[PDB]
Amino acid sequence: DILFSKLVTSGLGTVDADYKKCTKGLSIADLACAQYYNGIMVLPGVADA
Amino acid sequence: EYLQITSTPIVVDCSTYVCNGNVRCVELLKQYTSACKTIEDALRNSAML
Amino acid sequence: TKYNIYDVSGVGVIRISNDTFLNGITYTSTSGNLLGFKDVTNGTIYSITP
Amino acid sequence: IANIIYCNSVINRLRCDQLSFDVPDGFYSTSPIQPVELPVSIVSLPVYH
Ligand SMILES: *[C@@H]1O[C@H](CO)[C@@H](O)[C@H](O)[C@H]1NC(C)=O
Ligand SMILES: *[C@@H]1O[C@H](CO)[C@@H](O)[C@H](O)[C@H]1NC(C)=O
Numbered sequence: 001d002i003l004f005s006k007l008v009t010s011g012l013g014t015v016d017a018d019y020k021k022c023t024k025g026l027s028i029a030d031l032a033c034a035q036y037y038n039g040i041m042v043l044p045g046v047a048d049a
Numbered sequence: 050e051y052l053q054i055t056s057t058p059i060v061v062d063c064s065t066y067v068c069n070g071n072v073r074c075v076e077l078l079k080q081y082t083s084a085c086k087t088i089e090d091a092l093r094n095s096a097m098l
Numbered sequence: 099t100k101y102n103i104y105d106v107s108g109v110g111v112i113r114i115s116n117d118t119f120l121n122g123i124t125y126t127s128t129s130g131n132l133l134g135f136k137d138v139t140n141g142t143i144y145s146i147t148p
Numbered sequence: 149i150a151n152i153i154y155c156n157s158v159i160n161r162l163r164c165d166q167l168s169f170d171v172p173d174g175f176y177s178t179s180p181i182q183p184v185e186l187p188v189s190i191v192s193l194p195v196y197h
Contacts, residue, residue: 029145104191
C-alpha cells in the first residue's frame with residue numbers, strides 16, 4: 001500500500017471506466033468516461049488485487 | 050529489485066474513434082477494408098496473450 | 099437527437115445532471131466533444147451522451 | 149463464386165465486418181445502429197438581433 005499511495009495516484013493514467021455509469025448521464029463524464037465516447041476502452045488490469 | 054510484469058491493455062473501436070458515430074462516415078470507412086481490421090486485430094491479440 | 103448547442107453541432111442524448119458547476123456555459127472533453135452545457139435562464143446543467 | 153453467406157444475423161454481420169468466414173474466439177467490439185427520426189434541439193444565447 002505504501003508503493004501504491006506514496007507514488008503519484010494514476011488518476012490521469014490508465015484506470016478502467018465504469019461503463020454502467022458512463023451512459024447514465026447522471027453526472028458529467030470524467031476523464032475515463034470521456035475516452036469511452038471515443039472508442040478507447042481501458043480493460044481491467046490482469047493483475048487482480 | 051523491481052521488475053514490471055504487466056501493462057494495462059487498451060483496445061480501441063476503429064469505427065467510433067475515426068467517425069465519431071456519424072452514419073455517413075462509417076460508409077466511407079468501409080472502403081479502407083484493411084485499415085480497421087489490422088488495428089483492431091493487433092490490439093486484441095496482444096491483450097489476450 | 100441532432101443538436102446545435104451554443105454553436106456546437108453533433109448527435110447525442112441530453113439528460114439532467116445533479117452537477118452544480120459555477121463557471122461557464124459549455125464543458126468539453128480533451129477531444130473537443132461537448133460533454134455538457136448550462137441553461138442561463140435557470141442554472142440547470144445538462145449532460146450529453148452518444 | 150464458390151460459397152456465400154448473407155450479412156443478416158448477428159454472427160454473420162460480425163463475419164462480414166471481419167471479412168472472414170471463420171472468426172477466432174475472443175472479444176469483438178461492435179456498435180448498435182443509429183435511429184433515423186432524430187429531432188432537432190437548438191440552444192443559443194439571446195443577443196441584439
Ligand atoms: C449526484 O447523483 C449521484 C447519483 O445519484 C450521486 O452518486 C452523487 O453523490 C450525487 N451528487 C450530488 C451533488 O448530489
Ligand atoms: C429550473 O430549476 C428548478 C430548480 O429546482 C427545477 O425544479 C426546474 O425544473 C427547472 N426548470 C427548467 C425549465 O429549467
